[PDB]
Enzyme design. Structure first.
Site, mmCIF file in Angstrom:
data_model
loop_
_atom_site.group_PDB
_atom_site.id
_atom_site.type_symbol
_atom_site.label_atom_id
_atom_site.label_comp_id
_atom_site.label_asym_id
_atom_site.label_seq_id
_atom_site.Cartn_x
_atom_site.Cartn_y
_atom_site.Cartn_z
ATOM 1 N N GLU A 1 38.999 49.700 51.824
ATOM 2 C CA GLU A 1 39.270 48.793 50.718
ATOM 3 C C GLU A 1 40.686 48.263 50.696
ATOM 4 O O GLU A 1 41.643 49.017 50.497
ATOM 5 C CB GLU A 1 38.953 49.411 49.345
ATOM 6 C CG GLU A 1 39.288 48.443 48.193
ATOM 7 C CD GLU A 1 38.984 48.963 46.794
ATOM 8 O OE1 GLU A 1 39.419 48.309 45.818
ATOM 9 O OE2 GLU A 1 38.304 50.004 46.660
ATOM 10 N N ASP B 1 28.893 56.681 41.896
ATOM 11 C CA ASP B 1 29.745 57.801 42.296
ATOM 12 C C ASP B 1 31.021 58.029 41.486
ATOM 13 O O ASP B 1 31.930 58.722 41.949
ATOM 14 C CB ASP B 1 30.081 57.714 43.794
ATOM 15 C CG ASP B 1 30.934 56.504 44.143
ATOM 16 O OD1 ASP B 1 30.366 55.431 44.435
ATOM 17 O OD2 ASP B 1 32.177 56.632 44.148
ATOM 18 N N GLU C 1 34.582 52.559 54.363
ATOM 19 C CA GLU C 1 35.150 51.692 53.340
ATOM 20 C C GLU C 1 36.665 51.494 53.333
ATOM 21 O O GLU C 1 37.396 52.219 52.645
ATOM 22 C CB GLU C 1 34.703 52.107 51.941
ATOM 23 C CG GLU C 1 35.144 51.087 50.909
ATOM 24 C CD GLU C 1 35.093 51.591 49.501
ATOM 25 O OE1 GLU C 1 35.909 51.105 48.687
ATOM 26 O OE2 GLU C 1 34.244 52.460 49.204
ATOM 27 N N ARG D 1 30.880 48.474 38.826
ATOM 28 C CA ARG D 1 31.073 47.743 37.574
ATOM 29 C C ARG D 1 30.185 46.502 37.495
ATOM 30 O O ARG D 1 29.528 46.272 36.482
ATOM 31 C CB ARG D 1 32.540 47.338 37.420
ATOM 32 C CG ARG D 1 33.413 48.409 36.789
ATOM 33 C CD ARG D 1 34.891 48.221 37.126
ATOM 34 N NE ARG D 1 35.347 46.838 36.980
ATOM 35 C CZ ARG D 1 35.481 46.199 35.820
ATOM 36 N NH1 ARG D 1 35.192 46.806 34.677
ATOM 37 N NH2 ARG D 1 35.945 44.955 35.805
ATOM 38 N N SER E 1 27.189 46.569 47.139
ATOM 39 C CA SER E 1 27.258 47.980 46.790
ATOM 40 C C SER E 1 28.181 47.957 45.587
ATOM 41 O O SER E 1 29.352 48.318 45.669
ATOM 42 C CB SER E 1 27.845 48.808 47.922
ATOM 43 O OG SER E 1 27.646 50.181 47.656
ATOM 44 N N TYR F 1 54.627 30.343 35.080
ATOM 45 C CA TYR F 1 55.667 29.573 35.749
ATOM 46 C C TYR F 1 56.960 29.730 34.955
ATOM 47 O O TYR F 1 56.861 29.920 33.729
ATOM 48 C CB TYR F 1 55.283 28.090 35.844
ATOM 49 C CG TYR F 1 54.206 27.802 36.869
ATOM 50 C CD1 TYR F 1 54.541 27.491 38.192
ATOM 51 C CD2 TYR F 1 52.854 27.877 36.531
ATOM 52 C CE1 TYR F 1 53.556 27.264 39.151
ATOM 53 C CE2 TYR F 1 51.861 27.654 37.482
ATOM 54 C CZ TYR F 1 52.221 27.351 38.791
ATOM 55 O OH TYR F 1 51.248 27.146 39.742
ATOM 56 N N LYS G 1 29.819 58.301 51.737
ATOM 57 C CA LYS G 1 30.810 57.293 51.383
ATOM 58 C C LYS G 1 32.206 57.923 51.360
ATOM 59 O O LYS G 1 32.415 58.995 50.787
ATOM 60 C CB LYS G 1 30.495 56.666 50.026
ATOM 61 C CG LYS G 1 31.522 55.648 49.587
ATOM 62 C CD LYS G 1 31.838 55.832 48.122
ATOM 63 C CE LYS G 1 33.191 55.239 47.797
ATOM 64 N NZ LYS G 1 33.101 54.079 46.881
ATOM 65 N N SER H 1 32.615 45.074 44.789
ATOM 66 C CA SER H 1 33.029 44.066 43.819
ATOM 67 C C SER H 1 34.533 43.798 43.787
ATOM 68 O O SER H 1 34.958 42.645 43.779
ATOM 69 C CB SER H 1 32.492 44.400 42.421
ATOM 70 O OG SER H 1 32.659 45.774 42.095
ATOM 71 N N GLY H 2 35.338 44.852 43.776
ATOM 72 C CA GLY H 2 36.776 44.663 43.754
ATOM 73 C C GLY H 2 37.275 44.068 42.452
ATOM 74 O O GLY H 2 38.036 43.095 42.452
ATOM 75 N N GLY H 3 36.837 44.653 41.341
ATOM 76 C CA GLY H 3 37.254 44.191 40.026
ATOM 77 C C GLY H 3 36.628 42.899 39.536
ATOM 78 O O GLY H 3 36.996 42.393 38.477
ATOM 79 N N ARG I 1 35.344 54.935 30.971
ATOM 80 C CA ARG I 1 34.252 54.010 30.679
ATOM 81 C C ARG I 1 33.536 54.435 29.396
ATOM 82 O O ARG I 1 33.314 53.617 28.494
ATOM 83 C CB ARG I 1 33.269 53.958 31.855
ATOM 84 C CG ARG I 1 33.913 53.527 33.166
ATOM 85 C CD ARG I 1 32.975 53.665 34.363
ATOM 86 N NE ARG I 1 31.989 52.586 34.459
ATOM 87 C CZ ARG I 1 31.827 51.810 35.530
ATOM 88 N NH1 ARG I 1 32.581 51.980 36.610
ATOM 89 N NH2 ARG I 1 30.894 50.866 35.530
ATOM 90 N N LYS J 1 31.805 48.781 54.277
ATOM 91 C CA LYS J 1 31.897 48.478 52.854
ATOM 92 C C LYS J 1 33.268 47.859 52.633
ATOM 93 O O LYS J 1 34.178 48.505 52.119
ATOM 94 C CB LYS J 1 31.748 49.770 52.046
ATOM 95 C CG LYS J 1 31.504 49.586 50.566
ATOM 96 C CD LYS J 1 31.137 50.910 49.931
ATOM 97 C CE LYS J 1 30.752 50.756 48.476
ATOM 98 N NZ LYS J 1 31.839 50.165 47.662
#
Lengths: 363, 363, 363, 363
Positions: free
Chosen positions: D189, D33, D187, D303, D300, D363, D146, D271-273, D42, D229
């Site tokens: 997120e 989508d 979803e 990437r 689902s 650090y 969605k 996936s979330g990156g 992309r 989702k």
């Protein structure tokens, strides 16, 4: 939002354990928390008159049944007085229960008070000094508590106020309980009174349990350290429509699958004025239902485990053993029921008395 | 929704009448509801013993001041004890207070209790058996009640839960009170402890009160038979910024204008650690603000009215009148303030030293 | 919670000013935002085809009424078409309205949509791309907007879902509005349909507005830059009980006094099927209620300001003056009504006409 | 409340079926989508122009996969354009998907809009005209939708408002979908941005999910015809604490267990990156988690199912099959992962991700 853990890994540990012991496969809860007034009514039904000795003796009768009961009884909810009473041999009641393998429960609420501006709805009191009492109770052998909230189905009941208010208080009690190593049984009781069908009850049940769990989330309750004591979805006591036990098992299981998250250790159904036989038969079908049940589905019965025993006893001290037998039978019947290993005779029989009373018995 | 009148026109009338008698033009409220513990702290400071006689005498001292106070005092909040105490003439303190044209009030909450899973936040308990206490208190001359809910400002406070919870307990208390003819004073106190500034306090006050009022709506509270005792929007007691009383008055009046509906009969501000003189000045400026105020803006002071009297009392009969005069002075000073007629006196003497910390050593 | 300035002092300024100017003493709002279909229905009645020309002319006939209307109407709500239209002189309609001392309004909502699972209830759409539209409207001379949500009183209506929904969607529309310098008129319209009496309407109206303002608070709405366009508390359009103008006046003001915070600049009542004279008479008595009203109480009439004008025009150019007069006279009458200075020959409110629902034919 | 069936038994049946097909054992969802704007970036990385044809070719590349993915892909989410594009053989894309055994999806939201008064928080628009959009999409083979909602974690985020508002909007979209026989994928997120640990995210996730479900209940949503989702409970991208996939899986499933009612047919994580392998590994660990999982836990991925195949293409039309294979392997890998039978391990030593944050350099 920012977390601020109310419970530590160890406190959560104890809570989960206790909960998992009560609802362990084949086990249930004995509701022996009848107040002096509730028991007074029941003792008089057989002709016996109310008195502490009679109450102690009667409670002892149920609690000292032969060891066959041990694998069936996971917990026994008691009333304040019974908790501090002793068996004939001088052994304090919680010790008897404990030696039989069960966890001691305590009734902690202080009754229902009306809500102003409602159609006769109520809320429950008992939050005052609850911590202090929960501390004494646990120190004296209590591992779980019971708090009852009543809801009624009518033309404009339950209202938004009734639902939200009652949920919110159950959440408060629960929060307090956990802080003192007490496992809280959340009882959102929807009364069977009325002529409403199965759908209405199911619809109502779904709505109230929604509010209940959202409330618990707001109050930060550890669900693994809780037991739910709801009503089985059934038609109103005045409904002219007959339903199969399967339809009841269906309506019930579905409502739960839609509102009760998996983290909940178990659901202990209340008999709700059903006859002994009927109570077990329904609990059986509920565990016989094809749908996926993420949690235990057992019992927390009061009258549905004492009816025949009370009658058989009839106050006659000599009838002790005959009375204890009835208790044992029902216990075993329900032990099988919470597993879906129960078989009946398609009706009720002896366990079919009670009788529906409409505006007749004030006393 | 479907209405189910909590009060009949007669009950509403009484409630609206009482609430109007307390906030009548130029009249405020005397908070003499200190409990044995709270008053102890104050008696030991001057060197007097925390005895029932000592507490009684001091209470009498203020409750028997000359008639000049009659127009300044619309009501006196008393603690359970003082309510059942008699003055030297054999007259019950409530009769003494009401003869002088004052309405008797009673403190009914049972203190703050921790909220699990919060950052040191709390809620209030006292609802248990409240109706029986309110019904009885009515029988003994008490016409209004007081319930305190403490809130706090911090990095993550007040939290949604603390706000929702306290707001709900307040509405419960009111509902019960109004059912027994008692007028409820909602006291959603937002603590001045901290370093937050005016903006933040105001912002929090707007949210707390919006929640408080929505809760009263859900609970069907009769807004006309209620009084709102809030905090004045002031910066934190550790903030590094000087604010003119005009700013304080602006922030306060603006906050109330955004959340407190007109139907509310009156607002009774509390001192909250302000010096007697400061309490009078800020309340005076509040009343002097150019914004429209559809409700009485008066006081409900404790230490701000008693500070100099306690000190001038010394703990002995010798200073009886010397003390009464300081009280009289402070009340009529505030009586003028709740009308915008007060003129700052200044600063020179007769002040009160609230605790010795960095002073003296061998006296 | 913590603050994150939604609006800046300058933004709050602009909004407060725009809102105050519209509800200035004696000034009200002309609601000529009829959609192409809605106006078509009206034109059809007078025998006039729904031509953009006809629509432009009619809207012109109202907007070009001589300067007598000038001190009467502070705002004009237009439809998207009208905003871009020009009068005969070549000047755009907003410039016409502006030169006459009024601020231009524009409807922004996209109509109502059903709420599945409710007794035929709705909610309102229009939030998508709103910000972009509001920015454009502003550049085009529109200083305020209108959003209408419909609610109905009935057997199980309005429900909690509807109340919560519309109250929330209004707050969304409002927030967006303030960000683009547009003053939002929040319209929670409770339909007068049904046989519900005056008390039922007051109760629902109280509850709806309580939800409204709590929603606005959650969304951080600047109340000084908002207007409320409610319904007057009247009995149902099928009620058999007859009520006086003073009663509806008292019921409307009481309801408002219990929900609308003092900070709300003004209340612009809608006609709601009331007659032209009935609307102004009711508006007048409302402003003649002894109860303290902290805010402006004016009109925002549509058919109650157009009926006679539209009727007299008859789609005939030569009837222009007659038509405009019917309008001017209507505006004048309401101008006095909002000030509580409207009295017809008789020093009393005119009697009704039909009143069939009170006759023996409604039994 | 009162029952008002939003769906007929057959409507419920259609939804249940669709949702069940999408998440049948071993199946997952292909997320294609990407809006024209997003897909452009992309295409830029592989030196390809973002044109009508280039996008169509790329979508075809994935959809016209080798039949080996037939048992792997339960559903494909398409952007509006792609839904009306046809493959080289002359078949509309939704036809290709159907024949290969997968159900066609379409994202309906219209993007995120900023919430005023919050710390840069957001809500999602898209509800306007959504109904008619669903009736058309359904007409064109769509069976599921969605709608994305973004909630960021931070010092004071997400706020009570962002949770309440996003929950309500997700429920509005859900209701509209079920009305048009479309299964809605909720979803919420929760962004992995920041240095917050694992526990903070689990807590927030529990809170967010708790609200989502309550809102769905209020809106009368049919749980058996919905798919969640959510994000996996993973620490912030800037966190400096090493967490094994087993810790992630544990935190994740427990969160869902405490909120998601068993009625929720399935959960299709995003996936979330995450990298392709990492996503397969975490999903596998999630499914082989000892705790009882009452819903289908699948994927689902966007990437995490296109990454390698996309690179391989690199614009070169020749690379068609080589790229298609990389996709097949990914689909098959995840097919095994959604069942807990995927050979892996995952160590940040060989093929590592941006472990800089954990490195001493941070650090």
């Amino acid at each position: 939002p920012h977390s601020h853990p109310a419970l530590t890994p160890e406190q959560k540990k104890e809570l989960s354990d206790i909960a998992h012991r009560i609802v362990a496969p084949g086990k249930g809860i004995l509701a022996a928390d009848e107040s002096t007034g509730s028991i007074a009514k029941r003792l008089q039904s057989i002709g016996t008159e109310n008195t502490e000795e009679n109450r102690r003796f009667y409670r002892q009768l149920l609690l000292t049944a032969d060891d066959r009961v041990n694998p069936c009884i996971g917990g026994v909810i008691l009333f304040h007085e019974t908790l501090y009473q002793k068996a004939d041999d001088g052994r304090p009641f919680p010790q008897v229960i404990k030696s039989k393998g069960g966890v001691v429960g305590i009734m902690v609420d202080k009754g229902v008070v009306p809500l102003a501006g409602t159609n006769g709805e109520t809320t429950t009191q008992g939050l005052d000094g609850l911590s202090e009492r929960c501390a004494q109770y646990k120190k004296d052998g209590a591992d779980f508590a019971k708090w009852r909230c009543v809801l009624k189905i009518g033309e404009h009941t339950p209202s938004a106020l009734a639902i939200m208010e009652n949920a919110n208080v159950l959440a408060r009690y629960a929060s307090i309980c956990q802080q003192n190593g007490i496992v809280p049984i959340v009882e959102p009781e929807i009364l069977p009174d009325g002529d409403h069908d199965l759908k209405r009850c199911q619809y109502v049940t779904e709505k109230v349990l929604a509010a209940v769990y959202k409330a618990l989330s707001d109050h930060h309750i550890y669900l693994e350290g809780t037991l739910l004591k709801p009503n089985m979805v059934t038609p109103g006591h005045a409904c002219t429509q007959k339903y199969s036990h399967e339809e009841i098992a269906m309506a019930t299981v579905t409502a739960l699958r839609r509102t009760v998250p998996p983290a909940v250790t178990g659901v202990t159904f209340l008999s709700g004025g059903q006859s002994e036989e009927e109570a077990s038969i329904n609990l059986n079908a509920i565990n016989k239902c094809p749908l996926l049940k993420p949690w235990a589905l057992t019992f927390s019965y009061g009258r549905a485990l004492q009816a025949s025993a009370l009658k058989a006893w009839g106050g006659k001290k000599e009838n002790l053993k005959a009375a204890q037998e009835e208790y044992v039978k029902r216990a075993l019947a329900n032990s099988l029921a919470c597993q879906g290993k129960y078989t009946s005779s398609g009706q009720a029989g002896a366990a079919a008395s009670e009788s529906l009373f409409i505006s007749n018995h004030a006393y």
